[PDB]
Structures are given as C-alpha cells and as structure tokens.
Design a protein around this ligand. Structure first.
Ligand code: ICS
Ligand code: ICS
Ligand SMILES: [Fe+3]
Ligand SMILES: [Fe+3]
Lengths: 522, 477, 522, 477
C-alpha cells in the first residue's frame, strides 16, 4: 500500500510488513536457501587470514577488477581534440558500454560511434564496415577529424586499420585530406590508460611524422603538456591556470574539459573546445614536452623523444607538495619564466592547511587503489601528511612502477607498514582490509561494497570509503574536483581531514555513552 | 497530428544521410495508423545497424549476461574474456535481490577470466578450468556457474561447452556455457534468445524426474520480470493477494531452484514477451503449461491484467481478484486526483529497448498524458504489431533510431517529456526538455502495480514540472 | 592501562572496563543521580508537542542562541582595512573571547586589542585607558589606523569615544593626523552583524563626511562593494573574480581575505591586504555603492545615500541563480559593461548541475538558521532547487525581514509548508525538528547537539546537520568555501545532493536487510 | 642559556614601549635563578594589564563561569547579561562529563538572559525571576541554578542576591548568585576567588547538619581538576586503585551532591592550587580537613605524588600504592623507551594560565626535554615561588606576556616547541615552530596519570617531528 501524501520508493517501501512476509514466504518455499547459520559461518570465514591465503593464491579467477579495457581510454583521448568523433572499429556493444560508463561518471553526453561489425565481418573482415562507417559518420555528425580505435573482435581477426582507411580514401568514401588517425587498442593488453597512450601516439604520429623536415625545437616558445587519462576537469583547469600565472606559453594536447562541461542553455553542443589540429601540427616546434602521467605515457614518450627530439623531463605526476614544486621548477627552467608570487602564496597556504590539520591526520592508516600515476601521487601526498599508506593496490601496475613506489615508501618512516600490490583486484583488497584493518579506504565507487562487507562484520570493523578516483557513480559532480597541484592537494587534504572528523563525530554521538568526546571544537 | 507533416519531417531528417544509409533508415521510420495491424507492411525491425550512425543498441552479451542470466542471484556468472565487458556491466542494471552478497548471492560482483594476450594466443580452456576450481574454493555456497562468452571466445575457437561438461561432472555442479559473444546478432535480442536456449538446455529440466514438489491448482510463475527497483516484488504481492502461489520468478530476485521448479506450475505469466517468449513457448510445448502476457503499468492495465489472470482459475480466485481491486481503488484514485491535473495534456516521446515503449503507454494515459512518439532498439515485428493498436493516429514510430534522428525528431515535435536511457538523458536535458530514465527508472521505482503507480506519478510530476527547466535562458540573453 | 603500539585517547580509552566500572561506582555512590527511567521519561517528554508549546511560551529565558554580540562584527569589519588594528574600548575578557572565536573558525591569527578597563573606570570613566592604550598600540604594533569599538561595560557607563579620542590627540598621545575612526557597538542591541554595520559606518564617516565638497558621483568610474559580515573567504574572492571578468572597476570596502589567509612561510604577518585609506577617501567618487547583505547594512545605506548621494540599488544578496542574475544585471546597467560569455557559461553549468540532481533534491525538507541575508539567500536557492524549507530560523531577524521572506515563500509552491521564526533560539529549533521532522538541518556547528538529541530518540528520528554558516568549529578549512554567485551555488548544490546520497547509502548499507537499494549508480 | 644574553634580550624587547608601559613591563620579566625563593624580589605578578598591548588574559566571568562553575554538570548556569559572553564560552573548554545533556546535565548548553536595551535601562531582576521559573518548567531534573553576572549586571543597579534568595526559598531550590562581572579584578583569577566564595556561601554547607552519609578513613576529594579530556578520570582510577575512596571531584564531571559531600572526607587532594586554594583553606579551617598539592603529570611526578598521598594514610594504603607503581611501571617505561630518543634534547617554551606552566615540566623532563622559558597569564607570587625552584638557571620568566613580547622572545630563543593557547597557536605555526595547545590538549588527552603520559608523549612526538615543519621554505626561494 501507499499513502498519497508520503509516497515511498523501493527503500523503505519493501520494509513494510506485507512485503517482508511475502519475501519470507518466497525464500522459505522456493529458493532452497542455505540456512542463515551457514551463511554467517561462511561470511565469517571469508573475513579470515586462512581465506586471505586462499584468495591470494588465485591464478585464473579475477573478482571485482579495478581497471577497464583499452578503447575506453582511446575514446577519452579522442574526445580531447576539436570537433573530433571517436570511432571504434569493431562491435557496437563496446561503444554502448563506453558511452554509458562515461555518462554515469561525468553526467554529460558522450559522443562515440561504431562500425557495427557482425559475424559476417568475423568471416570476411570489416573493411566494408570501415568504408561505410567513415562515410556515414562524416556525413551525419560533420566532424573535423575521426579518431579510430579498435575493439577486441577487430584485434583478434587482425583488421588492418591502415589499409582499410587508405582504401576508404582512395575509393572516395571520405576525402583524402580528411584526417583519420588510428590506433590499435587491443583490450587483452594493458588497460584503459594504455588505450589512451596508444590513441594519443596515433594522433601525434598522424599529424607530425611526415612533416618533421621544417620543424625546429623551441621555435614556438611553448611547452607541450600531455595529461594522459584524466577524469577530473579541475586537473586540466588547474594545469592551465598554473601555466598562465607563470606566463608560460603552453599547448595542452588532448583537452576534453570543454566537451565534458557544456552549459545547459537550450542547445546540445556535440563538440566544444579541444586541442586543434594546428596545435598538433605545430607541437614539434615546442621547447619540450611534459607528460603529466608518465607511468602510462611510455609509448608517447618514445615517439616524442625519438621523432620530435624533445628531451622529455623525468617528472612525477604533479600531486602533493614536493612533486608540484618539482613540476613548477622544471617548467621554470624550460621556459625561463620565474615562479610568480601568487604560486608561492598558494603553496604557503597549502602548507598552512597542513600545519592546521596535522594532529588529526598523523598516523592514520589507508588502503588505496587506482591507476599507477594517481596511486603513486596519492601515496606521496599521504606520506607528506604523516599518514600511513598500508595497502597500496594498482590492478594495472607493473613491476617497475612497484619498485618506484617502494623507493618512495622507503624514503619516509611513514611508509614502513606499507605493501604495494600489482595485478590484485578488489576482492584481494577486501581480504586485506579485513585482516589488516586500515582507518579508511581511498578509491572509486566500487569500494562501497567493501565498506558494506566490513560493516556486516561489525561497526568496529567498518572501513569507510573516501571517493577519489574513477569511476565515481554514486555521488554527484565530484568529477569537477581537482587533484593536481596545490589546489588539488588542498581539496584532498580537506576531504581527508573532514572524513576523519565526520567518522569521529559519528563514533562519539551516543548520549551518556560516548558523547563525553562529542566536542564542539576540533 | 498532420500525418503529412510527420512524413515530411521524416524525409527532411533523412536527407543528410548518404544514399545507402538513407535508403536503409527509411524503412525503419513510419507514421502510425492503428488500423494497420501488419506492421511489416509499415515498419521494419531487427536488422543490422548502419555503421557510424551512433545507434543505441548494446550486444548479445548484454542481452544474455546483463539481462537474463545476471539477475539469478545464487549463481556465479563468469565474464569469459577481456576485462571490459564485465566491468562496464557490473551493477549497472537495478535487478534487485535479497541475499548476502559474496556469500550466497553474487549479482553485483564481477567474476571474469580477464583475458591477456597469452590467453588469446594459446586459448583459454585451461584458464577456465582453473578458474572454476578457484570459484568452488572461494565461494562454496554458490549454487551453479554460468560462463558468459565475450567476443574473443567465439573468435579464437575456445570450447567452453566441453570444459563446462567435464567440470560439472567432476564437481557435481551445474555449469552453464553461454555462447553470447557480442558480435553475434545485431542487438541484445539474440542475447535473450541464446540465454533462453542455455536455460532450456542446462537448467530447466534438472527436475523432470523429481516429483517431490507439492503442487496446487494456483501455482504460477512470473517470467520476464527482472525486478528493476523491485518491480517484480510489487507485482508478486498483488498476485499473492489474489490467492495465487508464485512458485518461480524469472529472473529478477531469481534463484536456480525457482527456475528448476518452474515446469511444475499451472500458468506462466509473461511480462517481457520479447526476452522470454522463447522459453515460454518451449514450456508450453514440453510441459503443457499455458502462458499469457500481462501488464501491471498503471491502474487500468493492472486491473485488466488481474481480471484476465483470475479468469484462468476458478470462482474463488475471481472473488479474491475483485477484493484486491476494491482494496486498492482508493489508493490509485487518490494518486490520479493529486497528479493528473499537474500532467493533463502533456506530450511524451519514448525510446526504450523491447517491451516498455508500448507497456508504459497506459500508465501515461492514466495521468492524462499522450505518447506522441515511441520506438525500440531491438524489437521485432510482432512487437510493433502489438504497438500500433495502442498508439494514436499519425504518431511517429522509429526503429533503431540514430542519435541524430532522435534529436531532430525531438527538435520538431517538441514533446513535454522524453523517456529513454542514459545515453540520451543529458543530451535532452541540455536541450531543456525534461527527461526520465525509462530503463533504470532514474534510480527510483518500482513502477509496476498499484504501489508502483504512485511512484511513477510522483516521478513524472517532479521531473516535468521541475523549476530548473524554466531557467535555461539567461535573463540578459 | 595503555598499549604502547596502539595508544588510545579519551575516546575510546574511557570505554575500557576499569574506567566504566569506576564511573559506575562514582555515579552510584556520590552523584545522587536521577534513575535512568526518570531520565528516559523526561527526555521523551522534551521531544513532545506539549513541551514545544511550553518551550515557545518562553519570554525571559534564552537557550542556545544563534547570534553573538556587536563588537565581534565590529572587529571583523576593522580587520578588512589595511594595516588596521581593531581596538575595543572596554574590558579585556571580551577581546580574549572575540579572538578565540575567530581563531577557531578561521584557524588563523586574529589581531585585536583592548584598553583593559577595570573597576576603577566604572567610576572615573575610561579616558585614561583610551589615551594610554592608543599610545601603546600605535607604538608597539605600528598600525596605519586604529578602529575603535566598545564593549558593554563602556556603553553602560556612557564613555564618550569622540571626546576621549580628541583629547588623546590634543594631549600628544597620538598624532593628530593619525586616523582613529570609532563606533559605539552596544552588545545589548542587535547582534554581531549590527556591530559590523556600525563599525563600517563609523569608518566611512570618518574618512568622507568632512571632505564631500570636491566629490563628484561617478568620477572614478568604479562601483563600491560593501560585503558586510562575511566569514567565507570564497565569497570575497568570487565577487572580485566576477567583477574582474566583466571588466568592471570596483572598490571592495572592508576586504579581510588576505589577513585571514596568510601563507605559512616562516614569518608572522600581522597585517596583509585590506581596503586602503585612499580607497575609502575616494569612495564617494564612485558610480554607485552596492551592499551585498542589505538586511544588516541599513545604517551604512542611510549614510551612503544621504552623504555620498549614491542611489544604492535595491538588490538581494547574490545567492542562487535568480539573485546572482539580478546582481550581475544591475552591475552591468550601472557600469555599462556587458555580461561576458564566461559568466553566461558558468551560469549554464550551474543550471546543468541543477537539471542533473533535481531528482534527488526534489521535495527534501530542511530546517535552517543563520544571519538574515544568508538565511534568505539559502531559502531562495532551496526554492529554486525544488526543496522545501520547513523551519526557517533567524535569531537576529526582524519583522520586516520576516515579511520579505514570507513574500519569497509565497511566490513558490515549494514554500507552502514553511514557517519563519525570528527571535527564536536553537532550543526552539530542537523542538521543531522533533515535532515536525525535516530531512536535514543547514546551520553552524551548534546544530551538532540537535543531531545528537534526535539520534538519541532513535535512528529513524535523526536529523543530520549540513554545516553551512558561522561559526564552523568541528570541521577544517570550510571557511575557504564559497556561497555567493554561481560558484557558491554550485558548491552548495554539491554539498546538499551529496549529503542526501550519503544518508541514503548509510540507510541502505545493511546486508540482506536494506542493501537491495545499495545501488552502485545514483 | 647565557644569563647576560637573556637580560640583554629583555632590554632589547622592552625598548619599543612608551616609558610608562616599558617601566611596568620591566617588572614582569625576570631571568630565573633556582636558588631564589622569594619571587617578589625578581618578578611581579597579579597586576593590571597595560592597555593596547594585546594581553592573553580573560576576565572574571571566564574564571568563574568558564572554569569553576560551568563544569558542574547537574546544575544550570545562567549567563546573566547580553548574549556575547555565554556564546563565546559555550563548550569552548573540554571539561568532560557523563550525562544526558539537556535532561539531567547542562554543561555544553548556553542559558542566558540575553539582555536587551530595555533590560539595561529598567533593570533585569524581574526578567531574572521569570527566567528562573522558565528554567524550572523546562528543565525539571536540574539540581540547582547558578547566576553568572556579566559586566552590565554590576554596572547597572541589579540585585541578583535578593532574587536568588527569594526564588530559592519559593521553589525550594539552590540558586547561587555569582558576582563575576568581567570588569572585576584583572584576569580569570579573581573569577576563581569569587566562584569559590559562592561555593562556600551557598552550596558547601547544606549538609552541615546531615550525618547520614557513611564515611571511611580512606575518603578523599579531588579539588581543582576540571577533567580536561578526562584528566580527572585518569587520575581517579589511580587513586581508587591505591585503595582510596574519592567522594568528590571539583569541578570536572562534578555534581552538586559531590560538592555538598566534600566536608565529610578525610583529605583534600588539590590539583590546581591557584583556582581552589581558597576553598581548600576554608575547608581546613571550618571542618579540619587537611589538604595537599599533587602532580600527576608524567611518571616521576605521578609516582612521587602517589607515594606522598599513600604516606598520609595507613600501611595497607602504602602497600597498595607500591603495587600500583609496580603494575604501571612497564607501561610508562615502554613509553619512555619509544619516545625519549625522538624528543631528547628538544627545547620547549610555555605560556599558560595559573598552574600548568610549572606543573607539566616534569613530564617534559621525563621525555628528556628542557623548558627554556615559561610564564603565566594570571599567576600570583606564590606560583612563581614554586616555579623558580621547578625551573632551571638562566631560563626566561614572563608574567602576563604581550603578544609582541612573546613573539620577540621566541624569535630569539628559537625553541623546538611552544605550548600555549589558541590565540598564539597559529602565530607560531606561521613562524614555522611546532605548537601544542596546553589548555585543551589540542583536542586530545587526557595527559594526567600513567595512561595520560602515553598520550602526552605521542602528541609531543607527532607534532614536534611532523614533516610539515620542513616544508615552509619553497625550494625556489
Ligand atoms: S528484458 Fe529487455 S532495454 Fe524486456 S533488454 Fe533491456 S528490464 Fe529495456 S525495454 Mo533496458 S526488452 Fe527488460 C529491457 Fe525491455 S535492460 Fe530492461 S529496460 S523489459
Ligand atoms: S583552573 Fe585555570 S588557563 Fe587551574 S583558569 Fe585556565 S583547566 Fe589553564 S593553567 Mo586554560 S589555573 Fe585550569 C586553567 Fe590552569 S582554563 Fe585551564 S588550561 S589548571
Ligand atoms: Fe551534466
Ligand atoms: Fe591557518
């Protein structure tokens, strides 16, 4: 039943007695459910060290991974170029999924097309799909450029993207002058960040490989910036703002911030902003190229150093205090621009917040996961705050990255209880946070189920989730946040300390039991 | 109105296409005529999508893993292949269930083989066998395993059927191989068909020799309700109040024992004909169980449905049905009285998958609203046969609509409200048109049944009459 | 006892069995405590409608007020002027309190002096205190200006500030040309916002009253901005940024943002930033004066219109979509500067965020309190979101303000269940949120005790607190936030919708009980 | 260090003052010599503050309402006057208590008469009487009412004594008038004295005729512990482990019945001599109860204090004392072993109120730390008499230090750590010097007793050795 003046949705509607009784009848009569005592015993067992030992012996089963497939990264990279349509050569279901994933993270339209290969293409390849799809896409959505990636169907059958696109051009399906960069993005290799790297290298090669003769390093007095797979609009914005404050000429290559933040003013803008083709063509003339997320920009680095002849600086991701300092100093050295007083003051304000919050941050134990560069930047900042990373997980990390993170940890006393895991998933992490309980988790929305499980063990075992990373599906507008630079460090510090204080307030709220510590002033 | 105006709009929209694409898309757009009950002479459907045109369709794996098999709560469903497919579909569909996740229920988890290059080159059958052993060790209370094939599985010649047979015999466990590779078919629809075939072949008949289940003349099964936001529960309560015993519930909040018990019921109640007609027809042929379509969207449809269902049983059930109708009459009457004046006259366009674009129309008309356009991603021509008589004269029909087409149609028709999926939502919100998600109910619901109707009416009012929509024009523009 | 590896502070240290037993012994033996059943019965009674009737019959007793005294506002205003020392004529305990209050809100050093009047000044007056204090303050802290306010001691004995300061100047304690504006700030009148108004009017009069002869309205092509009592640094910053984007010349009068946000770089800067004396002297030459918080800037309005002859626009506080629009349009009309495309895009982005979270915001019921302008701006924005203000409390509001808020409420269907209370305190509000439970509270840190009480009744009765306003003592760095303009509206929208979703996640976390609704995607 | 250098520093700091202020402030700064016993001959204290110099002192209302009376949990304390004083002091001091706030405890609430202009002009006695009736109606479980006068009460001709007498006789309730107007005295200390007088006159002797309370030879009261962060509880546990029965603790977690029961104890244990010496001496004169000062800051002081207190009783208590010391020895030894190497050699300056500037030095010395400077807001000359023998040679002493003075002294001495209140914290954090709040324990604690010592050591290490302090200099400048 419903009351017209207070209508209930599924929660709490299904807690009504009639629904409870009906569900109990269903369970008793027809589900053949394991007895509740057995369920409790098995759950308790899944929280144990013995279960963790079994869990970490997994070799073939992956449970709740913390990564996606390459073409998602390729699509995100393609979205950063002006009037560019991401085009995925392969099956249409992949594109439906990529679009929905990005829709739910960004709460904005995401444009992407497929050439809808089917079993017929499994037998005879997808050349015809490419020709017709390029013609249809150009005719209908009128892009300045089509950036082609691949699904695993196309990769397994070995579709030659270069030959297909060239044949499409010669046979008149699309003009010969129309830019169609491409990249092979096999989903059984690496992850979404690798797909971003492959797509970016493809675009850069397409625009610069054959015209290097008249290129002179440093002649345009700019620094190229390659952000990599980035899902915080604040990060693009803060890099642009910081470079503008220094008076440093720059070229952000793959800038999707406008197309992912269009205003709601009565019209649908399929394209907005983005790196121009002229910027990509002129990039080799820059002073140097800076890679913001080097640990998944390796192929791009090889191309930029080998072909553009740029001496790409060895820089970490500009996260935290020290790495933001180092990034700014390297940019100053490359451009000859001094670091202005505004950035010095902003740095001092971050240091002031650190001194104001250190007493609550000190010694807090964290489990965290995400992409390699983001994870290592977060680890470095946590060590700067006097926090203890304990479980560091990166499902798509590698041995060299793990060694670099271990060297970061060894440089600080706060890293002594930390362990870095690569190739492990969120079920592994669930076991870890049960058997070596941290104070909090920092990760994406998939950590909410771990918080649910730890709460099920008991309130004293619950590990609250702090949502930083990608994807974030169960909170609104957090994609507007910043994690890079001093501003990002400030936002992260605020989030962390206020999560700590919010948990403390929750634990001390009980009247005459724990509220002796429910202080007004913290 | 103005059938000629709508046909002209169809032509003007089509002009941008290249010749082959335009000729194809012309067959998938039609102006409705309710007297026309042979939709094939009017509109065409269940064909391949035109490359490069930004279709909304998913793939077989979505139709099988995402739709049919995934909701089965006490089984573990393996996304066999590379990592993407299971990750994008993990917990994206609100097929609600009661269980202890990770212990005896597994719906919102993502089990995958996470194919690497070596699995592509040397095959993945041995990885699959080891994975199944690991599943058994780590999730002992699971009551069966399904293997949902992604594209490379079909492409590399892996034999998951033999692995499933061998391992199932070895461990005395039901292991269901599903060849739902995403390149098969043209949409989620063949995914439905493949999944239904897997149910028939590997699960449905396990108790053909078992006669220990006690049956009654009032045993029914709910087929093709996936319990989005609790829809199936909100329908089951009405069925049980009418005096029926719902033995099985496919597949939302479903369990494998319920599927196995389905052949023992007296009547199959099919909500989604599109996805479960295959198994319903099979059950009629093999077990003699009759089936019937029903509709619990809005008071008129649910009253008609309850009466029709009760008519299939004796007089006591019919009396109980009239009692249920009388008991709920004041609730939906109060809902109508409160929300119809706020929605009377407003016009809606829809675009959803295979059932709801026609099933929700009665609910919209119960609030005095008109559906001026509707269409499907993957419906078949029998679906449009059912759709035409329920839509008004000279209304627009679109099959497998492209993003550009639907945008232009909306720009011309200018409906007061659009109901579609997540990939269209923000597009039309930016155009200043209220939008309700008609797949996930916008993280609201249930909408089925009398209790669902109140939520439906409140949701439509809160979105349609929201003050945000009056603020898109800056006062200085 | 303690364990050296896991040391426990008061919570949870005092939950150890020995401490619990000792406290039980103390209570049973020597406290003569009311029996627990009596305590439960009285608490339950305090949650009732009959208790609310008794509570609202209060005439002489105030419990948990939601306002402070005038000199606190006067000190905040004085802090906004360059190298200015706030000087409170009266007793030193007041200054100790003002400084600690602002320290705890801003986590920043707050400079303020008193002349330490004692029992002797109660019969001889405080003239000698003023002379010696002005001399000592000027000699020691080297201010460019001393802004004099008063405590209630000085007001009751009727100390003539003008005569005292003039005599200090004639007798050589301070130079005759040294600026010493003053204002009477009686704490038994109005509240802290009134003190801000009085101090600002005093400073403006001191700098402009006697030099009006050569003043020409509009000659400097600027607009004066008076922010009033403002404790969000983001608000000053956003007003400056918005006026700079429009190319509008402006003069922010009383700007304390620099002195309340100095960097931690190894030195203590007692003064920083602030309105210059030259800006205050030249203010009458502006095109017009805009008051950002008119409902406590009345005396300032009288002076600005009567003496400067500025036609002060009738504008609400620039909070929420419509009032931000109106502020920008009035500024455009006054300055002749068009509204630029950047502000149009920002407005469209706020509308985008509204259209996305409307489904979660709609119909939510709120109790809120704070200062009049802030409260009415929040009410207007909540009505714009489709939210329902239910209990609107302003302890320092008046009848005219209440009528204006009632007119705002009547203009929207979402205002139908709202009631505006003036002169009521947080004990009144506690009763209200018990007897007509809202979904959330929006207010300052003093609302945490109301959340504690509602939780004590039961989890189903708990009303979570959303901390917006002043003071915020139990979270860190929230004083950096913004509430004005489109940016402030965006921040508030994000805070509200994510508070809603966080509560929903908490309510649906129970495994196999309510977690059927623990959706990944919201 | 280097006495002549320190007097040089005193002179150089003093040069900026005008001649009257300089001559005054010269008497309040001395270089310490532990041989000196009469502190009057070197440093002067308990004098009026210099106007305009940014003192740290509070007022008498803070000393009475904020310090002595406010912690009494089961009474309602009325801030009588305008709104500011009660609001700024509401829950600002962490005097912890067990109770149901708003029902039977009222510490963190702000009851006030909220004076308006009419109350200033026409007096407030009638408003006070009505307020007391309102309190009785709305908080029936309160066990007494105190009236804490703010500045206007003394200034205008209000007579709260007669109102309190009349109303208390009318309602059979204890109503305690306190004339703690902020203009009285020069600091919080006269507030202490006024509050103690109010306790003596209106509460302490209510049970002089009652002899129903059962007494033992081991009855003690804790006087002048306000239970900051639970300090008094952490001390009470040690006392009761020694075999003593703590009848009352003043005033943290204190109740009015405990105050009334205090005249029945055998020994008064005074923690804060400065604030409660008045009542302790009164109790010795009128009831014959001896009193002694004790110190539970750090293991050395705690052990010495426990042994002296036990020496005041029989042999059984002394044996129990040795058992307590033996039981706790490994815990504080482990704390010392872990944290002394991280703090050994570090130098600290302090500036606090009336007791803690000298009382905490033993704990710092237990962590191998040196106090190179200390001072008081409102101490008296007896306090400095104790401090000098507590402090080392050539250390700086400052009474009622100005903000400028303390900043200059710190800039010269350059200690590794400063302990003071909230108004100095952020100044010295900006100066790049680690700072611990020594009033509120930086929202940490307790620090008293063996359990408190571990928290103290952890806090000092975490702040002193925090990485933030190494980052104040940007690498490019
Ligand atoms: S199964 Fe089908 S697309 Fe019948 S694949 Fe799809 S939960 Fe739709 S119109 Mo999402 S044929 Fe169900 C459907 Fe309808 S996922 Fe749901 S809403 S009634
Ligand atoms: S009462 Fe006094 S200033 Fe003895 S007014 Fe002050 S809780 Fe201090 S040095 Mo705050 S004479 Fe207590 C004190 Fe010491 S408030 Fe506390 S820390 S031991
Ligand atoms: Fe959006
Ligand atoms: Fe600070």
């Amino acid at each position: 039943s419903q009351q017209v003046d207070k209508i209930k949705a599924s929660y709490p509607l299904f807690l009504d007695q009639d629904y409870k009784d009906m569900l109990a009848k269903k369970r008793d009569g027809f589900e053949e459910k394991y007895p509740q005592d057995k369920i409790d015993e098995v759950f308790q067992w899944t929280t144990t060290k013995e279960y963790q030992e079994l869990n970490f012996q997994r070799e073939a089963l992956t449970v709740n991974p913390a990564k996606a497939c390459q073409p998602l990264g390729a699509v995100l990279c393609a979205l950063g170029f002006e009037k560019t349509m991401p085009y995925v050569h392969g099956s249409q279901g992949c594109v439906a999924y990529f679009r929905s994933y990005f829709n739910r993270h960004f709460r904005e339209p995401v444009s992407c097309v497929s050439d809808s290969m089917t079993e017929d293409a499994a037998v005879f390849g997808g050349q015809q799909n490419m020709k017709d799809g390029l013609q249809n896409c150009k005719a209908t959505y009128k892009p300045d450029m089509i950036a082609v990636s691949t699904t695993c169907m196309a990769e397994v059958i070995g579709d030659d993207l270069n030959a297909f696109i060239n044949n499409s051009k010669k046979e008149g399906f699309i003009p010969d002058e129309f830019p169609v960069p491409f990249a092979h993005t096999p989903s059984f290799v690496g992850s979404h960040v690798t797909g971003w790297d492959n797509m970016f290298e493809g675009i850069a090669r397409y625009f610069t490989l054959k015209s290097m003769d008249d290129k002179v390093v440093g002649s345009n007095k700019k620094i190229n910036i390659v952000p990599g797979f980035e899902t915080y609009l604040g990060n693009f914005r803060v890099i642009k703002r910081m470079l503008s404050e220094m008076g440093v000429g720059y070229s952000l290559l793959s800038d999707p911030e406008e197309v992912l933040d269009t205003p709601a003013d009565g019209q649908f803008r399929m394209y907005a902003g983005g790196t121009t083709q002229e910027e990509m063509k002129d990039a080799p003339n820059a002073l140097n190229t800076v890679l913001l997320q080097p640990w998944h920009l390796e192929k791009t680095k090889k191309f930029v150093e080998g072909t553009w002849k740029h001496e790409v600086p060895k820089l970490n991701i500009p996260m935290g205090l020290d790495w933001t300092d180092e990034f700014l100093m390297k940019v100053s050295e490359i451009s000859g621009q001094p670091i202005p007083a505004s950035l010095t003051k902003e740095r001092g304000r971050l240091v002031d917040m650190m001194t104001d919050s250190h007493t609550w941050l000190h010694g807090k134990r964290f489990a965290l996961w995400g992409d390699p560069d983001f994870v290592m930047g977060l680890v470095k900042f946590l060590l700067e705050l006097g926090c203890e990373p304990v479980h560091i997980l990166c499902h798509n990390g590698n041995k060299r990255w793990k060694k670099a993170v271990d060297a970061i940890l060894a440089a600080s006393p706060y890293g002594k209880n930390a362990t870095v895991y690569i190739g492990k998933d969120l079920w592994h992490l669930r076991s870890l946070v049960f058997t070596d309980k941290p104070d909090f988790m920092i990760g994406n929305s998939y950590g909410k189920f771990i918080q649910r499980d730890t709460l099920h063990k008991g309130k004293e075992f619950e590990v609250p989730l702090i949502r930083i990373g990608f994807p974030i599906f169960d909170r609104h507008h957090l994609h507007r946040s910043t994690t890079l630079g001093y501003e990002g460090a400030m936002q992260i510090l605020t989030t962390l300390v206020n999560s700590i204080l919010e948990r403390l307030d929750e634990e001390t709220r009980g009247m005459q039991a724990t509220d002796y510590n429910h202080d007004l002033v913290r | 109105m103005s059938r000629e105006e709508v046909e002209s709009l169809i032509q003007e929209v089509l002009e941008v296409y290249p010749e082959k694409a335009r000729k194809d898309r012309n067959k998938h757009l039609a102006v409705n005529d309710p007297a026309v009950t042979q939709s094939k002479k009017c509109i065409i459907s269940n064909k391949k999508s035109q490359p490069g045109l930004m279709t909304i369709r998913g793939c077989a794996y979505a139709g099988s893993k995402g739709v049919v098999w995934g909701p089965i709560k006490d089984m573990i469903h393996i996304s066999h292949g590379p990592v993407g497919c299971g990750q994008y579909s993990r917990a994206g569909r609100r097929n609600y269930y009661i269980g202890t996740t990770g212990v005896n229920a597994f719906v919102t988890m993502n089990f995958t083989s996470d194919f690497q290059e070596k699995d592509i080159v040397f095959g993945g059958d041995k990885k699959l066998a080891k994975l199944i052993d690991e599943v058994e060790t780590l999730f002992p209370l699971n009551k069966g395993i399904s293997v949902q094939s992604e594209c490379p599985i079909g492409l590399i010649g892996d034999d998951i059927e033999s692995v499933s047979k061998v391992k199932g015999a070895e461990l005395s466990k039901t292991i269901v191989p599903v060849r739902c590779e995403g390149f098969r078919g043209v949409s989620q629809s063949l995914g439905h068909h493949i999944a239904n075939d897997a149910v028939r072949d590997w699960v449905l008949g396990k108790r053909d020799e078992d006669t220990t289940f006690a049956s009654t003349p009032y045993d029914v099964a709910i087929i093709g309700d996936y319990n989005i936001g609790g829809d199936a529960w909100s329908s089951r309560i009405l069925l049980e109040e009418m005096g029926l015993r719902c033995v099985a519930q496919w597949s939302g909040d479903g369990s494998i024992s319920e599927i196995e018990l389905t052949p023992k019921v007296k009547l199959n109640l099919v909500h989604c004909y599109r996805s479960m007609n295959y198994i319903s027809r099979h059950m009629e042929e093999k077990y003699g169980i009759p089936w019937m379509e029903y509709n619990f969207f809005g008071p008129t449809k649910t009253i008609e449905s309850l009466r029709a269902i009760a008519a299939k049983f004796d007089e006591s059930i019919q009396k109980k049905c009239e009692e249920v109708i009388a008991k709920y009459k004041p609730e939906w009457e109060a809902v109508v009285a409160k929300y119809r004046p706020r929605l009377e006259g407003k016009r809606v366009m829809l675009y959803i998958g295979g059932l709801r674009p026609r099933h929700v129309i009665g609910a919209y008309e119960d609030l005095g609203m008109e559906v001026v356009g509707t269409g499907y991603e993957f419906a078949h021509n029998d679906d449009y046969d059912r759709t035409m008589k329920e839509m008004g004269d000279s209304t627009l029909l679109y099959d497998d609509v492209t993003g550009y087409e639907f945008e232009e149609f909306v720009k011309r028709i200018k409906p007061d409200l659009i109901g579609s999926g997540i990939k269209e939502k923000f597009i039309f919100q930016k155009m200043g048109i209220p939008f309700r998600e008609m797949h996930s109910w916008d993280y609201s619901g249930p909408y089925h049944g009398f209790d669902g109707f109140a939520i439906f009416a409140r949701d439509m009012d809160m979105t349609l009459n929201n003050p945000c929509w009056k603020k898109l024009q800056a006062p200085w523009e």
